[PDB]
Amino acid sequence: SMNPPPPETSNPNKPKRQTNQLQYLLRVVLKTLWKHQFAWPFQQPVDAVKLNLPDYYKIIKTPMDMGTIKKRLENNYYWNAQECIQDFNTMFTNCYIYNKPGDDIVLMAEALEKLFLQKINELPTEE
Numbered sequence: 001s002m003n004p005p006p007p008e009t010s011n012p013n014k015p016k017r018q019t020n021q022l023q024y025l026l027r028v029v030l031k032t033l034w035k036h037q038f039a040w041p042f043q044q045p046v047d048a049v050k051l052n053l054p055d056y057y058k059i060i061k062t063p064m065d066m067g068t069i070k071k072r073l074e075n076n077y078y079w080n081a082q083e084c085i086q087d088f089n090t091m092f093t094n095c096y097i098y099n100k101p102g103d104d105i106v107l108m109a110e111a112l113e114k115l116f117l118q119k120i121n122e123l124p125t126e127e
């Protein structure tokens, strides 16, 4: 029923790069999803204590959220864009795994994911 420590957003021994694809993931994908009307449940880790969801982290073992993604992009945490894409996809998957189908929270995840796929469809060419 307690909250776990959040996902790591800084690892100085982890090699990093500043690429046009990673810049796109911040300037376009993260910003588009962040300003969305349905973004707010995904802007920070699930607070299982205040939400009284004691089984959330019993079930969700790779928690992920756009607050964590944002910090990772700002801290230049990633080596490539696929890592960051995987974080987004894990956050959507967590929501679909934990919640019942037809829940409003699932509809919010779906709306954000639709936009996500639209932006990733036009990921720029490297270099």
Ligand SMILES: Cc1[nH]c(-c2cc(N)ccc2Cl)c2c1C(=O)CC=CC2
Pocket (backbone or CB within 6 Å): 040, 041, 042, 044, 045, 046, 047, 051, 094, 095, 098, 099, 105
């Ligand atoms: C992704 C998510 N965000 C949130 C959420 C997270 C914070 N921190 C605040 C308010 C909400 Cl709705 C939830 C969820 C769930 O999946 C579980 C159902 C409701 C809680």
